[PDB]
Paper text:
The conserved 3′ and 5′ ends of each segment are bound to the viral RNA-dependent-RNA polymerase, while the rest of the vRNA is coated with the viral nucleoprotein (NP). These complexes are transcribed and replicated by the heterotrimeric viral polymerase, consisting of PA, PB1, and PB23. Transcription initiation relies on the cap-snatching mechanism, whereby a host pre-mRNA is bound by PB2 through its m7G cap and cleaved by the PA subunit to generate an 11 to 13 bases capped oligomer. A few recent breakthrough studies reported the discovery of an azaindole derivative (VX-787) that binds the PB2 cap-binding site and inhibit FluA replication by blocking viral transcription. Here, we describe the discovery and characterization of PB2long (FluA H3N2 PB2 241–741), an extended PB2 protein construct that more completely represents native PB2 cap-binding site.
Next, we determined the co-crystal structures of PB2long complexed with VX-787 at 2.4 Å. Overall, the cap-binding domain in PB2long is similar to the previously determined structure of PB2cap bound to m7GTP (r.m.s. deviation of 0.86 Å for main-chain atoms)4 and to the cap-binding domain embedded in the influenza A polymerase complex (r.m.s. deviation of 0.85 Å for main-chain). Although the mid-linker domain consists of discontinuous segments, it moves as a rigid body and is positioned adjacent to the PB2 cap-binding site in the PB2long structure. In comparison to the previously reported co-structure of VX-787 with PB2cap4, many of the key interactions are well maintained in PB2long: the azaindole core is positioned between two aromatic residues, H357 and F404, and firmly anchored by a pair of H-bonds to K376 and E361, while a second pi-stacking interaction is observed between pyrimidine and F323. However, one consequence of the extended mid-linker region in PB2long is that residues 520–535 impinge on the PB2 cap-binding site and directly interact with the ligand, thereby revealing new determinants of VX-787 binding. In the PB2long/VX-787 complex, the carboxylic acid of VX-787 rotates approximately 90° to form electrostatic interactions with the side chain of R355 and a hydrogen bond to the main chain amide of N510. Moreover, the mid-linker region forms additional interactions with VX-787 by contributing a hydrogen bond to the amine group and several van der Waals contacts (from N510, V511 and L512). These additional interactions not only explain why VX-787 has higher binding affinity to PB2long than to PB2cap, but also rationalize the substantial improvement in binding affinity after installing the carboxylic group. Moreover, PB2long N510T point mutant resulted in a 90-fold decrease in SPR binding affinity for VX-787. This result is consistent with our structural observation that this residue is adjacent to VX-787 in the PB2long structure, where the sidechain nitrogen of the asparagine directly interacts with the pyrimidine of the compound via a cation-π interaction.
Numbering used by the authors: 252 to 485, 490 to 737
The structure:
Amino acid sequence: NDDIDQSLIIAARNIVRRASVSADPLASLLEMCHSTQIGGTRMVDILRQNPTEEQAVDICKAAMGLRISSSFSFGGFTFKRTSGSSIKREEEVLTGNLQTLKIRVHEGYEEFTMVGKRATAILRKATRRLVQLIVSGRDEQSIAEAIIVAMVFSQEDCMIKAVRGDLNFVNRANQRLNPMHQLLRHFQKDAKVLFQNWGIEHIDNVMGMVGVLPDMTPSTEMSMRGIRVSKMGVSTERVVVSIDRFLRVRDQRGNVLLSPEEVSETHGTERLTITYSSSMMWEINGPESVLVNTYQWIIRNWETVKIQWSQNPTMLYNKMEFEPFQSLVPKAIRGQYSGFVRTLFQQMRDVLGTFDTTQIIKLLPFAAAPPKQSRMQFSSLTVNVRGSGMRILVRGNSPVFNYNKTTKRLTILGKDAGTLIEDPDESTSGVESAVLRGFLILGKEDRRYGPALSINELSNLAKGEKANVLIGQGDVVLVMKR
Ligand SMILES: O=C(O)[C@H]1[C@H]2CC[C@H](CC2)[C@@H]1Nc1nc(-c2c[nH]c3ncc(F)cc23)ncc1F
């Protein structure tokens, strides 16, 4: 039952990481935790009774209104205050790149332990001043990680002055990181200016403790100011917290104890099966599994989908289940697809007797994104699966979308998305109301209305005239305007 904690952590990290790029991360996070199982058992039942303290596991607990440890995480280190106190106060600072940052400065004298995977440390600090850091670690990278984190955490001015270049770090949701994570990211990328301008001191002789120079060389004579490396150098109060929309967890006094930027990037492999049900975890098996599941999901929920489509489309379009598919749509074009498809849907609602089940299913995931309006008459819509742009044809079949009108079996890149059931609202006349934006196809080629136009000269017609248009290769049909 150590194997549960191990697998609960793997599952919580995945879920938080997925949640934070979603539209509503707190909503997505709870949805996925109620969705998931760890070896037969509901995740949310393991979270209510398992005492494991880890960054992602605690974000989840916070989301379920549970109580978690008051320690906080910064740069992957768990800080536990061992003595002292501090007050918050807001300050503006000028970096070494003459950028202006508004920082939440802490004033007071404080002692902390910092605990990490590959190094731990004891830290003493005061207002904008590091007083002492004793760090022990597996190798020079680990020690250095700890030292960088303590240096940014001290908030000292020479750290601020050590910035080069501008700080514009964002997360995957393109949201700016708060300034302390701005500075920490900048120095995690390269720390030599920071180490060289920090300052050097002669050191006293103490058993089991050595100095460290700006190039991570050990020294029995000198050391970076206030820093020592030790050899043997090396948690139970739980409090009520608040979790806001973007999963930043706070304590009563408004300190951010945990956020998604504090989740470890390590990706281990479970020793118990983890089973995600959420649509959010479809992408686990590649964009192909996204597409199949999207269309599969629509078939299985057809009865609720068909009536929300018919009377409350706003809530249909905004559903959580359509976010994964939306990733696969080029961000440049997705809004104009959405605006194209929503109009075609509205034509099918307004012009009655022309309900097409296969067509609604095909285009429905494209209406998720915000409707930007265009006038291009898309003949196909594109989704990128592993870097290549596959196309769904607005009219007819396709490797991506292949429906079989007799067997009624829908196929998605090969795999069987299901089978459609007989629906009386299905139109029997050949009128297609959801292929051409602003136009209605009325069946086969009829020569008495003229010879075949092409699609770019449909604009030269106005207020519902009746023309034949070359829709494909050889395929000619009769199309009227609204
Ligand atoms: O801004 C916050 O509230 C966060 C972000 C910036 C550093 C910590 C981790 C992320 C900080 N969280 C917390 N800081 C502190 C905190 C105490 N003394 C400090 N001196 C400098 C500092 F910088 C933060 C602190 N206490 C509890 C926290 F929970």
